[PDB]
Amino acid sequence: MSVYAIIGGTGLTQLEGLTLSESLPIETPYGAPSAPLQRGRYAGREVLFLARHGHFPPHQVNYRANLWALKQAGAEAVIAVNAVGGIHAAMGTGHLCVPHQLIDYTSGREHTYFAGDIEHVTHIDFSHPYDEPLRQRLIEALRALGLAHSSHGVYACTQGPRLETVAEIARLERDGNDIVGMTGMPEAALARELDLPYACLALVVNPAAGKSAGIITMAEIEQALHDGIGKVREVLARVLA
Amino acid sequence: SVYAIIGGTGLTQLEGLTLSESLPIETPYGAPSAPLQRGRYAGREVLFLARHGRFPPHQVNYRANLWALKQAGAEAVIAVNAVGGIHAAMGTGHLCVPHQLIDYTSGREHTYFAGDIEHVTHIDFSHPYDEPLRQRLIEALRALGLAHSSHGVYACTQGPRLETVAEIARLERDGNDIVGMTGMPEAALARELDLPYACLALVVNPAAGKSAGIITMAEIEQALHDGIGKVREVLARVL
Amino acid sequence: SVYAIIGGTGLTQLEGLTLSESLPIETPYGAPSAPLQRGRYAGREVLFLARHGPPHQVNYRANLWALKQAGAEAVIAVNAVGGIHAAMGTGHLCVPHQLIDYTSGREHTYFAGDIEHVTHIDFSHPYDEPLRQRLIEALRALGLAHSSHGVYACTQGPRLETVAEIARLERDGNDIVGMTGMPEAALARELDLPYACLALVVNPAAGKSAGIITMAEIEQALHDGIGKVREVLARVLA
Amino acid sequence: SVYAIIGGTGLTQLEGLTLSESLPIETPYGAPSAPLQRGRYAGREVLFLARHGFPPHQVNYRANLWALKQAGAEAVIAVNAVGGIHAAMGTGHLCVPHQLIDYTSGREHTYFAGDIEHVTHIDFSHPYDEPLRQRLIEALRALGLAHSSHGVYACTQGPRLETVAEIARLERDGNDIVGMTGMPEAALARELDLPYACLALVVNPAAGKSAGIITMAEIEQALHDGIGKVREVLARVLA
Amino acid sequence: VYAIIGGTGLTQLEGLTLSESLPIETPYGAPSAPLQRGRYAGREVLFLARHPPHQVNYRANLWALKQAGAEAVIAVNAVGGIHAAMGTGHLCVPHQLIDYTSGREHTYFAGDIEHVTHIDFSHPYDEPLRQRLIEALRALGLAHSSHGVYACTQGPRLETVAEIARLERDGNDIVGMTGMPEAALARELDLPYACLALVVNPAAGKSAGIITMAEIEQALHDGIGKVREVLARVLA
Amino acid sequence: SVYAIIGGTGLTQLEGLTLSESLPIETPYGAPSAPLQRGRYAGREVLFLARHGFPPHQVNYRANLWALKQAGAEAVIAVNAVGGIHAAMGTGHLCVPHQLIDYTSGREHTYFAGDIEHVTHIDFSHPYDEPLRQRLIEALRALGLAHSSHGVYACTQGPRLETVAEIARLERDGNDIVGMTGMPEAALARELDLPYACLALVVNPAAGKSAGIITMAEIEQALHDGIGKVREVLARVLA
């Protein structure tokens, strides 16, 4: 029944049995979305796909435009796939974590619809950033599949593009975070401001700075993606049905 | 001595206060959120500013406001701020006179010392609030026998959204007792202008994670309607 | 091997340095803070750039591209800082080995806007270990009071920190605090330029000193400290 | 219903308190700090027990409590003098803690030691009886007294007071006040299913929360200005 | 040859014969219960029940296992779960611990002794024994954490909400009253030791109600089976 | 001013120092951990005490200090070998701490225990004496040795060394170095109104701060390498 949107890398589009047979190049009041909207059918449910970064560094992706376009195209739930670094010792490379909280360390990103010309200011609650029904459907799928996961975790959302500093990971860890990426916020909040239920699925693509012995290389990360993307796809499959 | 009050309207509902008209001012830093209301109270020249003018806290022109009050003769400032109670002793109802703050804001025009200006000034800001003003407020709270706290750390955050349970947890680890969106750059801008400044904080909700439910704009408006009166009592004694 | 130095002027009042050029260069990112001075010290091509010419508005991109364009193969950056760790009082030299970014709004990367590829640099160790050792080696030789390692807080400014702010920063692990370490250190890596920092403590951080921190007190510590800092720079360049 | 008060004597100085006195008790755990003083307060039966006469780490809480349970106590009010970590909780402040953190060690801390047949791990999530907590708050409010409705009580070991750095760590752990008597008392009340609340008087700012060093004269003075306040609060709670 | 320290019921494992039930004395008082030798899939097996936490004779226990010929130890622990990812019924294989106990006989190097050894205790659990545990949890498709920090509190009482929060502030994930000095003692006797902890309740203030023995014992009743399946494999 | 040096022998190799053998004294608190030596260094009186003569947590510190004071000690320099937690305090480094945090327990920590008729709670805000600190500092400068003028000393129980996670918690509590002998030593020194300072030599990078694990051999090399440095300091402070 309910229409789902999936935000993430293409190749999530290589999900077996998904059709994606439309491409509207949308222009919103908030400017250009990242890629055109792709609308399709999967296991009998209407499905939406937005590439988060087009064919743009995380801190300049027009998330506002993305979420408006999806709300409008008829989204009623958004599953956001996120590549992260693992801070928690148990959340190593290849691990899947379904966060339940986040701490936002971003700045200078268009992060609300309640700015510029508005006639009342609203302060959305945001105590629990992820819709709980979605989180459970992700968990139920991950248990069913016997994939190694954490059912909770705190998402540190940093600014990039640069990776983090060892003492910077020290502080994120002292702050309670389990995992760290650059694209979680303001996405989750803009979803909230639109009453759009949103939940994040996170693939750990590297140990965060200082956890492994060497240094973080883009090929370590590229490999990890390639390795784990199929696992993510299996989870979306079960969730989408 | 002339006194600015920054906070909401309703502050203007103070018994005994008169207001004589409101001039619109042009500052070198843009437009202030609202016209200044110049008035008289207990034989003391007073100016009021309604900081939100309908503006989100992150886009308020604090620079324009402060320069505006300075130029209009201000000599001290009491800022009335609505906050979230992190500390367990500071529930809905509570009044707090913070003595310290931690700024988590970011994209705001936050200093008078920007652009090619031939000389840059680094202000001390060790003690963000003028103590004599702080003592004026505390005395008033004691004298009125109201439930308050004499000290506390103010966490100033970006908004317009409210904080995450985990973000609150982080704030609690930084030593804050309350959280709001309006305290900074306001407090620092005043010191850049050598304007003694103090805040009076009203706890209008528990911070995310401290109450049993989610925070509703309904409960927060109720805590204001119930709390603006006691605030008015405090301002009154102070002037 | 060509070293560049970023910091105040008077860092050039270095004895035996024949400083010859004043090159005003233009960059794809706008103007650098000052003209690049080129010179020779000890028979090594030596590059100077005064970053001063508001820390949060300094064109850090322009400065580093300039240095890179001019032929720099390493960078020593000199920073005035407030001291958080109790062992690191007024006058203390420190060679930080880590840093924590608390800044924002600054044009902090080369990978911004219209580009066909985004590069997420590793940045686990903000500072080059070799350069660190050249600095460490020199302080030891000159018998100066210093610290081998230490954590740099970089804060927005131009305002100093609040007592509570310093408490947060200490809780985070910071030994020192300053407004210019970042994004400079990061842009250096983006340019594959080895970068290292020599910090001089010019005030105890807020609430570590007695009363307030005056500009005057800071001024006298720069006056007193620049002497030491030159001697270190001399030895490194040598 | 029978309320038992633990604190110094001179709490016994309530106007219109008959000190009906009292008998030396024996316990399977030893000798209690003082003979129990049994009295009446406006219809109510009240028990008193001075926890001294003995350094805090050597007080025999096990006997004290056991004896108080055996004498028929149904509720225990504990009065405690403390250093004040939280900026808002200076000298002479009254606090009513809601949580505690235990840093004590060499103490006979449980009735479930020894070679015993069934082990019991009590839940101790909320270390103070909430009904008792309200009864103290209500009393404080009604008397217009400056106080804190909540706080975290650090129980250290003594007899020496704390180091500056130790205080920084108690603060990072989230403690508001610091004292030497609060545990294992609160816990031992619980193993006996005996409602228990503490009322705390800050007698000194904790180490390094002020310029000098902590003096035993400062504390004497704070108990002098403090004691009367504490007594009026018991009069109400008892009534 | 392996030794398992946990409750009895770990000896309700299918495939295990318990032969000798000899009660040993040691230079450090009596152990918690007699030692029980056996075989499981052709390996010599020591089992030893550790039954009040702060008064159990951990010294006497390990020395006994050492002298009986133990060449590795698996300690099974009931714990409360601080980490939000580790609820009731989770299995955790910790890699670190932080020790908040005291008043316990914690070292073989006290009293008399001609020489005093300050052992290194950087890594309290043995990596190869963790890996065998983890390998096993993977094969059985059980929900677990490969790593985690163990807080060892004093008891017998449970923790305060604020005690828990400072344990959380310290980087801890689980909490139990029996992890220390067991690990450290094992180390002083060059015995490889690892722990497998079963979360049996959310730590204080991590959930709705209070912590109760009804709740904790159900979780133990529920979990014991998974635990036995893990040990069965690890001895295989 | 008469100094007592507490440390290993090897501190006794000072050139020009002479020492009378032992004589074993009995104290009210049992017997000191070694022969206490009386000395002269160029005519000046010095006491020497080796604290080990037993593991760190069973050392009779109560007895040592009581012995030291009965024999006329006016000040105390204690020389401690510690692991370094701070990045800038590698092996070989000298540190003059200014604060400390006690993580010990079960040790005889006070003179004011037992069944006495008066109790003393000392202030202990500043565990090390500032005049002695500077004497050590001025000395280390005079010899131009690398050192730290300040730092926080974590005093742990032992005999085992610390876990990587324990080190991370000691680090979060703001400690710079960790040893197992510093307390209750300093505190006892105070109960006796004896000015006490520590000089701490870093013998190993604390658990989890370098590639390997910590070997006893590595530590023993480190001492044999830094005791020479410490002797020099002592010689200067004693002159």
Ligand code: HPA
């Ligand atoms: O290590 C990381 N840090 C921040 N963002 C990331 N996205 C993938 N890995 C990382």
Ligand code: HPA
């Ligand atoms: O909960 C809060 N968080 C931030 N700002 C606020 N202003 C009122 N309440 C809050």
Ligand code: HPA
């Ligand atoms: O206190 C400081 N904070 C930030 N920058 C500084 N530069 C010198 N001192 C300081």
Ligand code: HPA
């Ligand atoms: O400062 C304090 N510390 C410990 N115990 C106390 N009891 C009263 N004040 C204090």
Ligand code: HPA
């Ligand atoms: O909640 C707990 N705390 C301490 N030990 C435990 N053992 C099981 N649960 C717990």
Ligand code: HPA
């Ligand atoms: O690493 C250490 N930890 C505790 N005590 C010590 N004594 C020397 N090194 C150490």
